[PDB]
Amino acid sequence: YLSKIEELQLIVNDKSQNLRRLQAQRNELNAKVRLLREELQLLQEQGSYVGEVVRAMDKKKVLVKVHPEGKFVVDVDKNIDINDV
Amino acid sequence: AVQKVVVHPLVLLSVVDHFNRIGKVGNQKRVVGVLLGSWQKKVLDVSNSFAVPFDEDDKDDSVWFLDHDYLENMYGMFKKVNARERIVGWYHTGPKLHKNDIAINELMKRYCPNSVLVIIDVKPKDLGLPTEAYISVEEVHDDGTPTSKTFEHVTSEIGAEEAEEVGVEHLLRDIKDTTVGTLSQRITNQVHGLKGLNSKLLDIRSYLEKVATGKLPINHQIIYQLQDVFNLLPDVSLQEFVKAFYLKTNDQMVVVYLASLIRSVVALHNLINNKIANRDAEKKEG
Amino acid sequence: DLYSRYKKLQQELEFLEVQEEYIKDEQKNLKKEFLHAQEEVKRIQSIPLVIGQFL
Amino acid sequence: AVDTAEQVYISSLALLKMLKHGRAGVPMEVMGLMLGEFVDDYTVRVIDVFAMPQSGTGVSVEAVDPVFQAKMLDMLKQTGRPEMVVGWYHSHPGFGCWLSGVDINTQQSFEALSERAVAVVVDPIQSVKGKVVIDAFRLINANMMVLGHEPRQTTSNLGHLNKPSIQALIHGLNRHYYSITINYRKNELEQKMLLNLHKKSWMEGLTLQDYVVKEMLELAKNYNKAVEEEDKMTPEQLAIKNVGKQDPKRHLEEHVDVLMTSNIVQCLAAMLDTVVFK
Amino acid sequence: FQRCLDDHKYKQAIGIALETRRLDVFEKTILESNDVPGMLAYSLKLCMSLMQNKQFRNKVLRVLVKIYMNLEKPDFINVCQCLIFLDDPQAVSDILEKLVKEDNLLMAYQICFDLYESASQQFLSSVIQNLRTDQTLKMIKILSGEMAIELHLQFLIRNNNTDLMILKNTKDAVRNSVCHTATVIANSFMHCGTTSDQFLRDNLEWLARATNWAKFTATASLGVIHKGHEKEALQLMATYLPKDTSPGSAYQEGGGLYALGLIHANHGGDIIDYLLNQLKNASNDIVRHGGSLGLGLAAMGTARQDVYDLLKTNLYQDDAVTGEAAGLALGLVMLGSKNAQAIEDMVGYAQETQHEKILRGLAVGIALVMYGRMEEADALIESLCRDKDPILRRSGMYTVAMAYCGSGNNKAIRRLLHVAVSDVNDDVRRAAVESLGFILFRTPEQCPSVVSLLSESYNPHVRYGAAMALG
C-alpha cells in the first residue's frame, strides 16, 4: 500500500488549504480599505451653500436666500422632494 | 566667492534637450552652452538656461567657437521676459574637463566676472550628484609660478523648489515613498561602504601613483593635512577604545530600554484584539 | 481506482501552494499602495489653512 | 470624412516650463506659443515650450509680437533645430481652468496659423507631485452643424479618454469643445537619468552621509504614551451583546509602525559606530 | 507486479507501471492476457491528461500505438491520436499504403475526418503531397476542402432558428454612437453561414453614417454572413469589387477584400495570388487591411514570401493600422513557427519607432508568431520583460499566453501574477489577468475561485480583466 497511503496523507493537506483560504481572506481584507481610501476625492469635492427657502413656485422651481445674499430662483434635482419644501 | 549652489533639475533637462539636438548631427566633441543663474547670496541658484553652437578641432585646443551676438540677444530676451535671471556660467556634457576649458571660462568671465561651469553626464551610472562647480582663482603657488590659474572645486548639490516636482514624481511613478523600516538603510550600507571605500582605495591607488609616479604636484600641502583630519582616529590593532566600550553600552542603553518596554507593549497591542476577534470569527463563524 | 486520486489532489496541492505564495506578496504590495494613499491624505494640509468655526 | 484618434505627446520640459512660467508670473495670467513637431494625424508632440513676452493691459492675440516671432524662432533655428509650432499656451491662475473669451478670439487666428492649433490651459496653484492640471482642446466649427458632432472614427479610445467627464463647466462648454488625450511619454535618453538624479541625489545625496537621534527619544515617548492611554481606555467599554455596543475603533495605529521605524533606525544608529568605526 | 498478477488487478498494476516512469513493466501490463482494450484505451486518456513533460508522454503514446498494432484488429484510434500529438507525416502515408492494400471505403473516411478537422492547418496541407505523390481519388475528395465547409454552410442555412424582434428593438436606436455597427455585429454573428441576404436591404440612412467602420462594418458583416460560400463570391460582389463601389475613403473597398478573406478563411484557392495582386495593385496602405488579414488567415503554411517581403518595406517605418495588419499577417502565416527571420525583423524592429498602434500591432504579431512552445521562447519573453513600459512586457504577457496554450505550466503564472499586480502601468495588468483564460482552457475549473479575489482590485483595469477571465 505504497501510494494507497501517500495520497491519504496528502488528503490531510486539505487542512493546509484552510490556511490558504484564510490568506485569501487576508488579501480580501484591506482591499476594501484601499478601495475606500482611494475614493476620498469624494471628500475633495467642492463645497456647497446653506440657504433659506421662502416657498416654492411653479414648473418645479424653488427660491433660496443664501447666507448674506438676496433671492435666487434655483433649480431642483431628481433625488429630492418638492413635497418637503 | 561662491558658497554653494541650488540647482533645479529643469536646467539639467534643458541640457538634455540640446544633447538630443546634437546626437542627431555630426558630433565632434561635446556641448558648450550658456548657464544662466539667480545669484542672491554667496549661495547660487539657477532657474533656466539655453545653449549656443560650438565646434572644436584638436590641434592646439584654441579653435573653439561661440556666438556672443546670439548669446546676448537671447540673454536680452530672457532678461526682458524675466528680470530675475542673469548669466552665471556655462556647462559641458563630457564628464572629464580638458585644457581648453580655462580659455572658455576666462573668455566668458568678461560679461559677469564669474562663470561657473557645470559638468553633467547624459549617461550617468556611477557618479553621485551630476552638478559640479569650479571657480577660477589663484593660490598662486608655493613656487609662485607665472599665473597658475586654477579651477577650484566649489561644493554643489541638486537644488529644491516648491511644486517643481509636479511633473517629476507623477512621471517616474515607481517611487516607493517612505521605505523607513525596510532596506533603504542597507542600500546606503552597501553603497557607502563599497562606493566610499573604493573612493578610498582609488585614493590609495593615487598613492601608488605617488609611489611609481607623482612627482608632478606630489601635493604635500593639503593631502596629509586633511588626511590628518582623518587621522584623528589612527585605528590600529588592540583597537584603543577601552574608554569607549562603556560609551557604546550607553549608546545601546536607552534604545534597548525602549525596545524591551515598548515591544512588550507591542505584544500587548497585538494579543488583545487578536485573541478576541480571533475566537469571535472562530466560534461565531457558524 | 487509486492512481486517479493523487493525480488530481497533488495538482490541487501544488496549484494551492502557487497561489499561497502569491497572495503573501499581494497583501505586501497593498500596504505600499496604502502608504501612497496615506501621503495623499497627508498632503491635504500643508501651505494653507482657512480658519472657520464649527456650527 | 474620417478622422483617426488623436494624441498629444509631451516632452515634460513643456510641463516644467508651464509650471515655472505660471509660478513666475503667478498673480497674473500669461500667454504663449507652443513648439513641437507635427508627426501625423493620430499623434502630435510638443517638444519645446519657450518663453513668450508679457502684456499688461489685456492678454490678446496681439501678445504674439511678430518681430519677436521672427527673432525667437530664427534664434531657435540657429539653435538645435528649426522645428514647427504645434499650438499655444496660456494660464488661468484665478479659477478652475476653463476657456476664456480671448481664447476663442484667437482660436481662428491659430487655426489659420496651425492645423490642429491645440490650446493649453493651466492653473499654477494646485499640488506638488500629483495633479495633471494641463487641459487641451479643439474647437470644431459651427459650419459642421449639419453633420454629427465629434465623430472620432472609433470612439473607443475616445471613450477611454471619456473616463471622468471632467470639469463640469467645460462640459457645459461642450458646445463645440472636447478635451484630448495627453500621455506623459517616455524619454529613454532622459527617464533613467532623471531617475538617477532624483533617487541617487535624494538617497543621502552622496549616499555616504547619515550612515535628531537623541531627543526624538523624548519626542517619540511623548507621542507614543500620550496616545497609548486613550488607546487602552476602550477595553473598559468593550462588552458582549454583539451589536448592542457601538464604538469599534482600532488603537494599534502609529504605535506598531512609528515605534518600529523609530527604534529600528535608532538601533542602527547605535550600530553606526561599529559600522563606520571598524 | 507479480503480486499485481496474483491479485489480478490491472489498475494497481498500471499505477506501479507508472511508478517506474518507464516502459519495462508498463510494457508488461499490456503484455498480460485478457487486457481489455477499453481500459487500455482510457489509459491513454489518463496518461494524456497527466504526464507533464513531452520527454516520454509521447513515448508512452507511441508504445501504446505499437501495442495496438500488436492488437489483432487493425487499429486506427491509435494512429488517429498519435498522428495529431506525435505528429507523424510518414505514419499517415503508411496507413494510406495500408489503404492501398485494403481497398475499403470506411478505411479512408473517419480518421481522415479526424485529421481533416482536428489537426494543424499546416500539417495535412503539407503532408497531402506525401500521401498522393479509388482511395487515391477519395483522399482528393475529402482532404481538399471541397465538401466539409460547404455542407456546414448547408447546415447553417437550413438550421436557422432566430429572432427579428430584438433587431427591431435595436433598429429603432437613433443616436450617433457606433452601436449602429453593433446592430450589424448582432445580425452578422447570429446569422453566420446563411448567405441569405435579408439585412443589407432594410435601410437607406441607417447604413449611410459614413466613417471608417460604417463602411468597413457594412461590407464586413456581409462576409460574416457569407462564412463559407466558396464559389459565388465574385459574382455576388460584382457590385462590391474594390473599384465598383466608390467608398467614403477606403473601407467600402477594404472590407470587400476583408469579406473575401472571411469567405476563404483557412480554405484558399486563388486567395494567395488574387488577393496579393489586388493588394499589390492597391493605391496605398490605407486599403490593404482586410485583404492582408484574410491573406495571412488563408496563407497558414503556404510559405508565402511576399507577406514577409513587401510588408516591412511597405510600411518603411510604420503605418496607420495596417502595420498591425502586417504583424498579424506574418504571425498567421508563421503561427508557432519561431520565425528566426522575423524574430530579427520584428522584435529588432519594434523599438525604434514611437507610435502606439504600430507598436501594439507588432506586439500582437510577435505574440502570434509564437504559440504552444512550452519552453521555447521564455528567455526572449523575459528579454521582452526588461524593455520599456507599454510594449514588450505587454507582448511578453500575450506571447506567454499563447506559448502555454493547453497546459497547466506553473512558469507563466510566476511572471503573470508578478507583472499583474506589481506593475504600475495598468493596461499590461489588464493583459496579464486576461492571460489565464488563454493558458487555462483545457482544465478551466481552476480560475474562478482565485480570480474572484482579483475581482476586487483598485482599478477597473484588473477588475475588467478579472471579469473577462471567468468568461
Ligand SMILES: [Zn+2]
Ligand atoms: Zn483667458
